[PDB]
Design an enzyme around this catalytic site. Structure first.
Site, PDB file in Angstrom:
ATOM      1  N   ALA D  91       0.812  -1.203   0.000  1.00  0.00           N
ATOM      2  CA  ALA D  91       0.000   0.000   0.000  1.00  0.00           C
ATOM      3  C   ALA D  91       0.850   1.258   0.000  1.00  0.00           C
ATOM      4  O   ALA D  91       0.292   2.360   0.076  1.00  0.00           O
ATOM      5  CB  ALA D  91      -0.951   0.006   1.210  1.00  0.00           C
ATOM      6  N   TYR D 216      12.505  -5.068  16.478  1.00  0.00           N
ATOM      7  CA  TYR D 216      11.151  -5.573  16.306  1.00  0.00           C
ATOM      8  C   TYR D 216      10.982  -6.936  16.956  1.00  0.00           C
ATOM      9  O   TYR D 216       9.976  -7.187  17.631  1.00  0.00           O
ATOM     10  CB  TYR D 216      10.804  -5.644  14.817  1.00  0.00           C
ATOM     11  CG  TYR D 216      10.318  -4.329  14.244  1.00  0.00           C
ATOM     12  CD1 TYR D 216       9.746  -3.370  15.064  1.00  0.00           C
ATOM     13  CD2 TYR D 216      10.428  -4.050  12.886  1.00  0.00           C
ATOM     14  CE1 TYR D 216       9.298  -2.176  14.560  1.00  0.00           C
ATOM     15  CE2 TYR D 216       9.985  -2.855  12.371  1.00  0.00           C
ATOM     16  CZ  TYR D 216       9.422  -1.918  13.216  1.00  0.00           C
ATOM     17  OH  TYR D 216       8.968  -0.716  12.722  1.00  0.00           O
ATOM     18  N   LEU D 244     -14.342 -14.491  24.872  1.00  0.00           N
ATOM     19  CA  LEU D 244     -14.334 -13.267  24.078  1.00  0.00           C
ATOM     20  C   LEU D 244     -15.460 -12.341  24.484  1.00  0.00           C
ATOM     21  O   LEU D 244     -15.260 -11.130  24.615  1.00  0.00           O
ATOM     22  CB  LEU D 244     -14.436 -13.600  22.596  1.00  0.00           C
ATOM     23  CG  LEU D 244     -13.107 -13.962  21.953  1.00  0.00           C
ATOM     24  CD1 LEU D 244     -13.267 -13.822  20.461  1.00  0.00           C
ATOM     25  CD2 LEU D 244     -11.998 -13.074  22.489  1.00  0.00           C
ATOM     26  N   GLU D 246     -16.976 -12.139  27.328  1.00  0.00           N
ATOM     27  CA  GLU D 246     -16.765 -11.584  28.662  1.00  0.00           C
ATOM     28  C   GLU D 246     -15.741 -10.446  28.658  1.00  0.00           C
ATOM     29  O   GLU D 246     -15.870  -9.517  29.459  1.00  0.00           O
ATOM     30  CB  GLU D 246     -16.363 -12.696  29.630  1.00  0.00           C
ATOM     31  CG  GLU D 246     -17.518 -13.623  29.966  1.00  0.00           C
ATOM     32  CD  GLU D 246     -17.122 -14.813  30.819  1.00  0.00           C
ATOM     33  OE1 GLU D 246     -16.219 -14.679  31.672  1.00  0.00           O
ATOM     34  OE2 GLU D 246     -17.729 -15.888  30.634  1.00  0.00           O
TER      35      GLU D 246
HETATM   36  N1  LIG Z   1       5.530  -3.937  17.345  1.00  0.00           N
HETATM   37  C1  LIG Z   1       5.814  -3.969  15.996  1.00  0.00           C
HETATM   38  N2  LIG Z   1       5.523  -2.930  15.241  1.00  0.00           N
HETATM   39  C2  LIG Z   1       5.798  -2.928  13.934  1.00  0.00           C
HETATM   40  C3  LIG Z   1       6.397  -4.055  13.351  1.00  0.00           C
HETATM   41  N3  LIG Z   1       6.543  -3.782  12.028  1.00  0.00           N
HETATM   42  C4  LIG Z   1       6.090  -2.585  11.773  1.00  0.00           C
HETATM   43  N4  LIG Z   1       5.620  -2.023  12.922  1.00  0.00           N
HETATM   44  C5  LIG Z   1       5.018  -0.702  13.042  1.00  0.00           C
HETATM   45  O1  LIG Z   1       3.900  -0.623  12.130  1.00  0.00           O
HETATM   46  C6  LIG Z   1       3.856   0.703  11.575  1.00  0.00           C
HETATM   47  C7  LIG Z   1       4.161   0.618  10.091  1.00  0.00           C
HETATM   48  O2  LIG Z   1       3.160  -0.221   9.540  1.00  0.00           O
HETATM   49  P1  LIG Z   1       3.457  -1.625   8.838  1.00  0.00           P
HETATM   50  O3  LIG Z   1       2.654  -2.705   9.490  1.00  0.00           O
HETATM   51  O4  LIG Z   1       5.013  -2.031   8.865  1.00  0.00           O
HETATM   52  O5  LIG Z   1       2.956  -1.392   7.360  1.00  0.00           O
HETATM   53  P2  LIG Z   1       2.019  -2.295   6.447  1.00  0.00           P
HETATM   54  O6  LIG Z   1       0.763  -2.608   7.185  1.00  0.00           O
HETATM   55  O7  LIG Z   1       2.832  -3.639   6.165  1.00  0.00           O
HETATM   56  O8  LIG Z   1       1.632  -1.448   5.178  1.00  0.00           O
HETATM   57  P3  LIG Z   1       2.444  -1.032   3.864  1.00  0.00           P
HETATM   58  O9  LIG Z   1       3.886  -1.683   4.024  1.00  0.00           O
HETATM   59  O10 LIG Z   1       2.404   0.433   3.862  1.00  0.00           O
HETATM   60  O11 LIG Z   1       1.628  -1.656   2.628  1.00  0.00           O
HETATM   61  C8  LIG Z   1       5.002   1.509  12.197  1.00  0.00           C
HETATM   62  O12 LIG Z   1       4.504   2.142  13.367  1.00  0.00           O
HETATM   63  C9  LIG Z   1       6.003   0.392  12.542  1.00  0.00           C
HETATM   64  O13 LIG Z   1       6.883   0.795  13.589  1.00  0.00           O
HETATM   65  C10 LIG Z   1       6.697  -5.171  14.173  1.00  0.00           C
HETATM   66  O14 LIG Z   1       7.215  -6.185  13.724  1.00  0.00           O
HETATM   67  N5  LIG Z   1       6.401  -5.090  15.483  1.00  0.00           N
END
Ligand SMILES: Nc1nc2c(ncn2[C@@H]2O[C@H](COP(=O)(O)OP(=O)(O)OP(=O)(O)O)[C@@H](O)[C@H]2O)c(=O)[nH]1
Ligand SMILES: Nc1nc2c(ncn2[C@@H]2O[C@H](COP(=O)(O)OP(=O)(O)OP(=O)(O)O)[C@@H](O)[C@H]2O)c(=O)[nH]1
Ligand SMILES: Nc1nc2c(ncn2[C@@H]2O[C@H](COP(=O)(O)OP(=O)(O)OP(=O)(O)O)[C@@H](O)[C@H]2O)c(=O)[nH]1
Ligand SMILES: Nc1nc2c(ncn2[C@@H]2O[C@H](COP(=O)(O)OP(=O)(O)O)[C@@H](O)[C@H]2O)c(=O)[nH]1
Ligand SMILES: CNc1nc2c(c(N3CC(=O)Nc4cc(OC)ccc43)n1)CCC2
Ligand SMILES: CNc1nc2c(c(N3CC(=O)Nc4cc(OC)ccc43)n1)CCC2
Ligand SMILES: [Mg+2]
Lengths: 123, 425, 423, 427, 431
Positions: D91, D216, D244, D246
């Site tokens: 996206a 991460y 769920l 509850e």
């Molecule tokens: N806790 C945690 N947060 C994550 C991780 N990967 C990404 N994030 C957080 O998620 C947000 C970015 O969204 P993503 O989930 O990586 O993006 P996506 O949903 O894959 O969407 P696009 O890559 O834009 O198509 C940021 O705040 C990142 O720091 C993870 O493995 N663990």
């Protein structure tokens, strides 16, 4: 004054008078019963009939609660469905309109190019 | 012959019946097997083809464990299954359930079993009906039965032995309701009713038998002595009260006022011989009445003295003289001041091993005094307290009784009270 | 008038129900394999009131075990007396009630209720003379509260002439399991006013307070509370189960204890209070708020009617003396327009671990305090409509909430009316 | 019976799913191929006739690189290939692409796979949806998914585990836009959303675990314990269980006010050389141990759900919670007479070997609905306003077909949400 | 989003394009014959972004080489790595555009453009997931500028959903005496404002200044200037080419770097600055790299970043170093220099680290700024444009090929509009 009254094989009886009296002399059918018992039975049965009538009205409310929740779920589905189709169509149209405008600008430039090449031959 | 049929209704009625029939058997020499080695006892006992002597009795109790006392008891072979009527649920302390719900269901069956007894009689005098005021069955069914007997045996005498409630030993709060309901409905259908106040009997067993907490057996064995004194000249060839109509002749000058006061003496502890005069004095002590009331608060209409055992007339008249001189026994003025005396030679008998001692001479006084209306007033007050708030009334109405029957029964008792007052002035 | 059908619904219902069967099986001499091994035939003369007698000279509780969740009934099978219950009397759903009265009473409970009624009906047909029904359950949860009141109503419709008796556990913030207990309890109180004949009010507020204050249990557990409940349930059922001067039944109980049909909510009480003893002292705990299983002070109101059960070897004259002596010294706390409104039974069979015990069943106008406490907690949530959407989501109207609390505030007013009434 | 379907959306959702499903397997003794040497793990694992225990899960991502690591990793045989769903183009950090342009190309396939998982459930409890707020897929595709789940499944419970953005670890500047847009459209479709703040998880890993620059995988392993504490009630037969329904009933006082705050304790360094039931309970009300940066002392609690695991007796929870009720610094709303829901599962928490978390005899996870979480919405809304006042980056959303009206409508919805948190806190 | 299609047009475009391919081929271990002789698979994990895999375990640049002048591709074919390019991807005309934008855009360039599209289509259709295109070209000549922008337009018509990225070399009187370069540059900038998504501004003025002032090159040649271009291009495409925490692509770059469609002209910066083929006797420190990155002496556009404000910044650090320390210095330079970052784009600086340094350097930093100071570049061109246009100097060179005066007025208006909106956002407040 003692007055003998009776004598028998296993007892005897008499009357003892202490003072004579001051004043001389002394100063529902089967059908009715059955009707009353039957009336009481009919009042029991009426009262019981009225209890069961109230409990049956509670059953129907319960069915109306359960049906109502089913209708709320169904109308939640129907509105979610309507709105999502509306959003996705309005978004599709919008994006197609932006792309069509971008290409129409590019194609106007393309015609201008041919006018540049034409002006060159005219001179 | 002059047969009397006994009907026992409710637990109190059945258990007091057990006591009386046991006592009758002891007095007439009838063994527990019904066999027996004066023929007046046939008024109370029929005879089968096996030579067994069977009480002319019907027991009505819709809880089978109560009736099981009869059919598994010491005298069980006396009784035939058709004499015992039972059900599933009792009346649950509810007069309306006893009278209307149970009553409509069992009344024809009960009358059928009575009719079978009556068909065996050649000169049926009538019925002796044993029941509580306070029980739902004792009150509610007994009153329906009395109505139906009035229809089915119109010219026959009906006497009651009625257990007047004592809260000390009762387990029902609604007993005043049941007592007024059944008194109202039975009033016009009983010729003579001997009330037994459970509180009076309790006090006599405590005072004179030195029993801390008298059992129902205590009360019932004492009650049997009174009943036996009253029925002695029906079951033996006595002289006074030789048939049922004579009770109304000797004690009931006014039909509604048909509640004689019984006084009995002596009551001697078995684990412990009084004169004719002493036992005669005891008949005029309120502590020996079967109903708590004060005879000084009333006038007598009638008074009979029933002596049993070694009693000679000179000793009775002597005793009566000494009382009249020292005490004021006020009769109503349209009635002679006097006593009808009977002596039954049959000796007073007690259950062997019981708490009553065997005495040489006993006496029961039966008096119609306006003072017994005090017992009605105590009942009417408790009735009034609860009925003003309609407490518990919905249990009676739930069984099909109309609420107005409470008011109609209670007015009758008001009229009964004024009838007693009018008579006592 | 013999057989009682006992039903236990939901988690609280099945826990206190199981403890009940534990305690009275011991009193009657029944081991967990149903075999009788007792010493006295007083233990068996009326044992059919609660137990069916099977082929192998064994006794099976006439008990039906109900839950929308399979868990706590799995833990009852695993419990001490788990093997005594008829296996086909476990009727359990799978998806639970979500702590939601609406789920137990309407959608989820409806899905299970006809399965329970079939088991109820199979037990009712094997009865010589059905006295009625004894239900154990909480009012604060979802299954016992919502589905239990649904069960009550359907049982009343199918057996309108049998007595309905409940042991109904009232919630307390002091020992809560869910945030919506005030809604669940108020919706159920409206059902019990209308459809039960006798309800023992088992108040978790009072159980906790007894454990903390009198028993010195600084942190009461459900085990501690349920030790009090099982002692109470044994005591109140004494005269149903043992032969005695009073052979009680559920209809006689109702007739004499309930002077007005809506006013059928009893304050239980028990002495001595114990954690896992004279006659005069036993008598006095009748007015001791410290011994009441409903968080109400009996001296805050007046007794309409009272039942007392004394258990153990003791002089019945000394008991009758003290009972009368307590009644007269406390005359201001009994209504004058119900004469002789205390009745006492004695039973020589002591409860386990005690020589003497006393149990009180009070119909007191002070019970209004329990209902006022629930009402105030209901109103504090409902005036803000907190959590309401979980109930309207089940199809309920808001008006059912207002109707239920106004009925409960009416019950309070009715109790107040007779408290003030004079002769 | 009682099954829950897990849906993991976008990179964050997938990688947290990796941590969760790995932990579930070790907790239940399931080997990476689904074979294993208490029946309630079946709420999360269907089973084949070969004895293979397959997660009731779908992994979705609009780009294949992250899910490719699952397809080639340690647990590549745990899932059926059809459960791991990827497109070609992601996206590009753009909600409009996750929700419309790109997401529409793959949404029907995902719903088909979910329907096949539903067909394997006899008593479906609902859906757990794992996603970030900030990514283009995590935000825009989750919104599309939730809307489609409402159409297909009506009001059937849908709960979310959501990653609230932290600038320190994020690689997108448009995250405030994506966050607010997905919150707007998801609001009426989610029953309950457990929010996790990457910054809070980061700071806990540094402070409690002696990690200078948490990865991460460091954050995800801590988040996995929190997820496991929540789902353990549904996967294990414990003493006190919470299903769920509850969770929703006891944590959500109003439909929009459905964002509880997770807290977890103890978080102990594995290398450091047992905390009581009282201590770990108290730590849950310490603002440092929160999983979302906010100050509960600034607000009022509306519901506290405490989920214990390990060696924990009900008496000790009762004594622990009785102390909490005496702390005047812990304020509940006027209209909450009782706010505690307790769960005790008796299987101790399990830690991945080679991980930084110490093994402990007992642990607790508290879910609290506090008005203080409004602070986190305030922080996000303000970053949204800063950029949106200049319409910065809005052209990237409008170019994919969105309208500006959706931005203001989303932001107005968020303003009403802030006003709702204020209102429910009044006396 | 995997494959990028590279296009290089005209002399500057093909010279800097060739150097780009030599530099990143060495970084990925590809020799001039297309064989991979590298030591780390890190070099191959994303090598498909720029290379197609061919027959004999070979890697061929996804590169199209374009010029109207035929000799520039003979220069490429004989340059180092000339053999690496697909022979069919050389598209050559007969006569250069004579530094005439109109020739490149409207006449000669238009006759060759369809032949270029042949090659572009075959590369693009063979792509599994095409990110888009990157074009190298000068704006001051005739082919790169005129035919380069014509190509962008034509490619955009067929691939309107792909990103258009360009490396655009701005002219400087210090480097070229061709007086009409302000004309060619302004006509080009007009096209770039409307048809590209991302443009790196490679300013010959800056490149000369760096070579003369910092590298002490008295007379810099294009080789000297192109060393700075190739180091910049290696650095800005680092996250496209290597696996890291940030797997960048051209669309995520544009979304996060471009808050307003027209404002997509980046100011690149590089540290350290070095002359070509020169040993580096001592590497630099992380805080050295961090501050020097934001120093006007290190910008590849002749603009002082302290004269404007950063809308958005992307920083790439390369080499073995602490990511703790890198975040530490990047946070520091932001906080002390808070006045040079717009307040209304929060968290508008993002940093990547890649452990693979460019050849010859142990550590390096590359800076991609969307700064409003870039208006200094466009104002400089605009002033040179006006000084000629007010005199209509050399206009017949353009009207002779068919153009009109009005097209000059319009392009000048558009560039001055661009300057205005940079200034608008420079002065904008969060209040
Ligand atoms: N806790 C945690 N947060 C994550 C991780 N990967 C990404 N994030 C957080 O998620 C947000 C970015 O969204 P993503 O989930 O990586 O993006 P996506 O949903 O894959 O969407 P696009 O890559 O834009 O198509 C940021 O705040 C990142 O720091 C993870 O493995 N663990
Ligand atoms: N003297 C005496 N009184 C008794 C006896 N049994 C019960 N009573 C009294 O009778 C009243 C209760 O009436 P019962 O006739 O025994 O009851 P019931 O009508 O058979 O029972 P229900 O149908 O359940 O109401 C109370 O006042 C008891 O104290 C007894 O054996 N002897
Ligand atoms: N930095 C750099 N600039 C160059 C290079 N070659 C040419 N230029 C600049 O490019 C502009 C002239 O454009 P060119 O690229 O030579 O011309 P073209 O695109 O090939 O078009 P024509 O030669 O006119 O057909 C001037 O600003 C020159 O300074 C180079 O190798 N490096
Ligand atoms: N006394 C007592 N109360 C309990 C017990 N278990 C639950 N409760 C109370 O029951 C209420 C919760 O309802 P519960 O029965 O557990 O839920 P259900 O399974 O939906 O019926 C709360 O008031 C709890 O305190 C128990 O074992 N003993
Ligand atoms: C069910 N267990 C039970 N225990 C007991 C009683 C009792 N009842 C029933 C009955 O027969 N009389 C009565 C009268 C009464 O007056 C106010 C109150 C209660 C009852 N019931 C009374 C003592 C113990
Ligand atoms: C093309 N090479 C490349 N290098 C880099 C970045 C980058 N992007 C893409 C992305 O994913 N996020 C992002 C966010 C951002 O905020 C202001 C700026 C730039 C980018 N792209 C960021 C570090 C180096
Ligand atoms: Mg992604």
């Amino acid at each position: 004054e003692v007055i003998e009254l009776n004598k028998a094989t296993s007892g005897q009886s008499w009357e003892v008078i202490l003072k004579p009296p001051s004043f001389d002399g002394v100063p529902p059918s089967l059908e009715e019963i059955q009707k009353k018992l039957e009336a009481a039975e009919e009042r029991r049965k009426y009262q019981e009939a009225e209890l069961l009538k109230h409990l049956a009205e509670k059953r129907e409310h319960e069915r109306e609660v359960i049906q109502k929740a089913i209708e709320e779920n169904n109308n939640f589905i129907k509105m979610a469905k309507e709105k999502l189709a509306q959003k996705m169509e309005s978004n599709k149209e919008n994006r197609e309109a932006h792309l069509a405008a971008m290409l129409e600008r590019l194609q106007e430039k393309d015609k201008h190019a041919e006018e540049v090449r034409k002006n060159k031959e005219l001179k | 012959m002059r047969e009397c049929i006994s009907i026992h209704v409710g637990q109190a009625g059945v258990q007091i019946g057990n006591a009386c029939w046991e006592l009758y058997c002891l007095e007439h020499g009838i063994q527990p097997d019904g066999q027996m080695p004066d023929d007046s006892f046939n008024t109370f006992f029929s005879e089968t083809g096996a030579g067994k002597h069977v009480p002319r009795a019907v027991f009505v109790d819709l809880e089978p464990t109560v009736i099981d006392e009869v059919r598994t008891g010491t005298y069980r072979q006396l009784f035939h299954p058709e004499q015992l009527i039972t059900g599933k649920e009792d009346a649950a302390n509810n007069y309306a359930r006893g009278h209307y719900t149970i009553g409509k269901e069992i009344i024809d069956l009960v009358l059928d079993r009575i009719r079978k007894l009556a068909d065996q009689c050649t000169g049926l005098q009538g019925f002796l009906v044993f029941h509580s005021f306070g029980g739902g069955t004792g009150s509610g069914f007994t009153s329906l039965l009395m109505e139906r007997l009035s229809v089915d045996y119109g010219k026959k005498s009906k006497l009651e032995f009625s257990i007047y409630p004592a809260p000390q030993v009762s387990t029902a709060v609604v007993e005043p309701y049941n007592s007024i309901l059944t008194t109202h409905t039975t009033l016009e259908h009983s010729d003579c009713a001997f009330m037994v106040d459970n509180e009076a009997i309790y006090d006599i067993c405590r005072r004179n038998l030195d029993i801390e907490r008298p059992t129902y057996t205590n009360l019932n064995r004492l009650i049997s002595q009174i009943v036996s004194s009253i029925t002695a000249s029906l079951r033996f060839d006595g002289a006074l009260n030789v048939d049922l109509t004579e009770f109304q002749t000797n004690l009931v000058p006014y039909p509604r006022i048909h509640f004689p006061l019984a006084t009995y003496a002596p009551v001697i502890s078995a684990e412990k011989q009084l004169s004719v005069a002493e036992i005669t004095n005891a008949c005029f002590e309120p502590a020996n009445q079967m109903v708590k009331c004060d005879p000084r608060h009333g006038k007598y209409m009638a008074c009979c003295l029933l002596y049993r055992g070694d009693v000679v007339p000179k000793d009775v008249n002597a005793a009566i003289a000494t009382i009249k001189t020292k005490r004021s026994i006020q009769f109503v003025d349209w009635c002679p001041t006097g006593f009808k005396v009977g002596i039954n030679y049959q000796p007073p008998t007690v259950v062997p091993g019981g708490d009553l001692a065997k005495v040489q001479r006993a006496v029961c006084m039966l008096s119609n005094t306006t003072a017994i209306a005090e017992a009605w007033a105590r009942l009417d007050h408790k009735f009034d307290l609860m009925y003003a708030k309609r407490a518990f009334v919905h249990w009676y109405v739930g069984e099909g009784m109309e609420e107005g029957e409470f008011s109609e029964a209670r007015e009758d008792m008001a009229a009964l009270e004024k009838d007693y007052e009018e008579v006592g002035v | 008038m013999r057989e009682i059908v006992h039903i236990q619904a939901g988690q609280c219902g099945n826990q206190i129900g199981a403890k009940f069967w534990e305690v009275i099986s011991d009193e009657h001499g029944i081991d967990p394999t149903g075999s009788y091994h007792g010493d006295s035939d007083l233990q068996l003369e009326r044992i059919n009131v609660y137990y069916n007698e099977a082929t192998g000279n064994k006794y099976v509780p006439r008990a039906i075990l109900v839950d929308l969740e399979p868990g706590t009934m799995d833990s009852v099978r695993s419990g001490p007396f788990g093997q005594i219950f008829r296996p086909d009397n476990f009727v359990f759903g799978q998806s639970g009630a979500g702590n939601n009265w609406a789920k137990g009473h309407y959608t989820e409970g409806a899905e299970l209720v006809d399965s329970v009624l079939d088991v109820v009906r199979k037990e009712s047909e094997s009865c010589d003379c059905l006295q009625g029904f004894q239900l154990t359950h909480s009012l604060g949860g979802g299954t016992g509260s919502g589905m239990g009141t649904l069960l009550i109503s359907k049982i009343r419709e199918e057996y309108p002439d049998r007595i309905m008796n409940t042991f109904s556990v009232m919630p307390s913030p002091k020992v809560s399991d869910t945030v919506v207990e005030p809604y669940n309890a108020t919706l159920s109180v409206h059902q019990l006013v209308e459809n039960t004949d006798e309800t023992y009010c088992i108040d978790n507020e009072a159980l906790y307070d007894i454990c903390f204050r009198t028993l010195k249990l600084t942190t009461p557990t459900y085990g501690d509370l349920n030790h009090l409940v099982s002692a109470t349930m044994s005591g109140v059922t004494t005269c149903l189960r043992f032969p005695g001067q009073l052979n009680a039944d559920l209809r006689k109980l109702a007739v004499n204890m309930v002077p007005f049909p809506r006013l059928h909510f009893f304050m239980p009480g028990f002495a001595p209070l114990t954690s896992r003893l004279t006659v005069p002292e036993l008598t006095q705990q009748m007015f001791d708020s410290k011994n009441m299983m409903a968080a109400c002070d009996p001296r805050h109101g007046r007794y309409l009617t009272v039942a007392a059960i004394f258990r153990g070897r003791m002089s019945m004259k000394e008991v009758d003396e003290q009972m009368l002596n307590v009644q007269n010294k406390n005359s201001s706390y009994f209504v004058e327009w119900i004469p002789n409104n205390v009745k006492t039974a004695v039973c020589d069979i002591p409860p386990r671990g005690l020589k003497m015990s006393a149990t009180f069943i009070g119909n007191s106008t002070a019970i209004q305090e329990l209902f006022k406490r629930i009402s105030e907690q209901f109103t504090a949530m409902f005036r803000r409509k907190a959590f309401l959407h979980w109930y309207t989501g089940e199809g309920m109207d808001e008006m059912e909430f207002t109707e239920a609390e106004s009925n409960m505030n009416d019950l309070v007013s009715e109790y107040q009316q007779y408290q003030d009434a004079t002769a």
